Amino acid sequence: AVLILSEARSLGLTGYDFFWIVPSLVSGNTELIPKEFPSGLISVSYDDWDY
Amino acid sequence: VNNVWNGMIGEVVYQRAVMAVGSLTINEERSEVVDFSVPFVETGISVMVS
Amino acid sequence: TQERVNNSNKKEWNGMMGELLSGQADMIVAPLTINNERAQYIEFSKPFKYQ
Amino acid sequence: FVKTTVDNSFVGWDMQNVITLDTSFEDAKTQVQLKKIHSSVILLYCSKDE
Amino acid sequence: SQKCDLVTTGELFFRSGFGIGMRKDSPWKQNVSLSILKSHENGFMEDLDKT
């Protein structure tokens, strides 16, 4: 996913009017984030803060 | 009223939404604060009786 | 209206609009219909009639 | 010349983006600029090596 | 109406008013059009048309 997003950034698919959506498999450990994930990356994940 | 507007024109003037579509109308005091564009229907005023 | 020059692919304006465009006048006060082709490079005013 | 003869024609062409490649095969500005081509009649102009 | 020997078949199609053409780079625009509106509500234009 990181490679795909980095490659597609140059092509212009991640501008101001695109909303990437991705399952919990790529959300990872919710602590380490590489310098390839654009902001606005809605991704359903299991709860780890509420209870 | 009291040197302030309200509704459509009021929200347009105070940089809140750059558009106003609907049943507006061209006037002389209105056009001095905003800028309309190419009227497309013929309005006016008329009398209706039973 | 707008016509084409003789034996060429260029575009030319004849009559009222051509006279106005070539620095020969500033107002066209006369019966003049509002059209998309005209309004490309002339700033109109609010209409004073409807027909 | 292309710009001045495409704005006078009576057929109505469609000017897309015009691209210049200052440094050939620099893979820092050639790739990003070249990757966005939504056309089919590319009209390059180089000497022989470029 | 004046030469009472003809008729006007049909009602209307492609309606568009007249106007006062001026060049794009002219300072008279913002003061001319407004004036027309100010002259379109105090019965001046209707009176002139009636006359």
From Swiss-Prot, chain A:
It is found in: Cell projection, Dendritic spine; Cell membrane; Synapse; Postsynaptic cell membrane. It comes from the Eukaryota. Zn(2+) binds at residues 31, 47. Contains an N-terminal domain, a ligand-binding domain and a transmembrane domain. Agonist binding to the extracellular ligand-binding domains triggers channel gating. A hydrophobic region that gives rise to the prediction of a transmembrane span does not cross the membrane, but is part of a discontinuously helical region that dips into the membrane and is probably part of the pore and of the selectivity filter. Component of N-methyl-D-aspartate (NMDA) receptors (NMDARs) that function as heterotetrameric, ligand-gated cation channels with high calcium permeability and voltage-dependent block by Mg(2+). NMDARs participate in synaptic plasticity for learning and memory formation by contributing to the slow phase of excitatory postsynaptic current, long-term synaptic potentiation, and learning. Belongs to the glutamate-gated ion channel (TC 1.A.10.1) family. NR2A/GRIN2A subfamily. This is Glutamate receptor ionotropic, NMDA 2A. It comes from Homo sapiens (Human). The gene is GRIN2A. The chain holds residues 236 to 286 of 1464 of the full protein.
Swiss-Prot record, chain C:
It is linked to Neurodevelopmental disorder with or without hyperkinetic movements and seizures, autosomal dominant: An autosomal dominant neurodevelopmental disorder characterized by severe intellectual disability and developmental delay, absent speech, muscular hypotonia, dyskinesia, and hyperkinetic movements. Cortical blindness, cerebral atrophy, and seizures are present in some patients. Neurodevelopmental disorder with or without hyperkinetic movements and seizures, autosomal recessive: An autosomal recessive neurodevelopmental disorder characterized by severe intellectual disability and psychomotor developmental delay, involuntary and stereotypic movements, spasticity, and inability to walk without support. Intractable seizures manifest in some patients. This is Glutamate receptor ionotropic, NMDA 1. The gene is GRIN1. Belongs to the glutamate-gated ion channel (TC 1.A.10.1) family. NR1/GRIN1 subfamily. Glycine binds at residues 31, 33, 38. The chain holds residues 486 to 536 of 938 of the full protein. A hydrophobic region that gives rise to the prediction of a transmembrane span does not cross the membrane, but is part of a discontinuously helical region that dips into the membrane and is probably part of the pore and of the selectivity filter. Glycans are attached at residue 6. It comes from the Eukaryota. It comes from Homo sapiens (Human).
Curated annotation (Swiss-Prot), chain D:
Changing residue 4 to N: Found in a patient with schizophrenia; uncertain significance. It comes from Homo sapiens. Contains an N-terminal domain, a ligand-binding domain and a transmembrane domain. Agonist binding to the extracellular ligand-binding domains triggers channel gating. This is Glutamate receptor ionotropic, NMDA 2A. Belongs to the glutamate-gated ion channel (TC 1.A.10.1) family. NR2A/GRIN2A subfamily. Component of N-methyl-D-aspartate (NMDA) receptors (NMDARs) that function as heterotetrameric, ligand-gated cation channels with high calcium permeability and voltage-dependent block by Mg(2+). NMDARs participate in synaptic plasticity for learning and memory formation by contributing to the slow phase of excitatory postsynaptic current, long-term synaptic potentiation, and learning. The chain holds residues 186 to 235 of 1464 of the full protein. It is found in: Cell projection, Dendritic spine; Cell membrane; Synapse; Postsynaptic cell membrane. It comes from the Eukaryota.
From Swiss-Prot, chain E:
Glycans are attached at residue 31. Component of N-methyl-D-aspartate (NMDA) receptors (NMDARs) that function as heterotetrameric, ligand-gated cation channels with high calcium permeability and voltage-dependent block by Mg(2+). NMDARs participate in synaptic plasticity for learning and memory formation by contributing to the long-term potentiation (LTP). Channel activation requires binding of the neurotransmitter L-glutamate to the GluN2 subunit, glycine or D-serine binding to the GluN1 subunit, plus membrane depolarization to eliminate channel inhibition by Mg(2+). It comes from the Eukaryota. A hydrophobic region that gives rise to the prediction of a transmembrane span does not cross the membrane, but is part of a discontinuously helical region that dips into the membrane and is probably part of the pore and of the selectivity filter. NMDA is probably regulated by C-terminal phosphorylation of an isoform of GRIN1 by PKC. Its phosphorylated state is influenced by the formation of the NMDAR-PPP2CB complex and the NMDAR channel activity. It is found in: Cell membrane; Postsynaptic cell membrane; Postsynaptic density membrane; Synaptic cell membrane. This is Glutamate receptor ionotropic, NMDA 1. The chain holds residues 741 to 791 of 938 of the full protein. Belongs to the glutamate-gated ion channel (TC 1.A.10.1) family. NR1/GRIN1 subfamily.
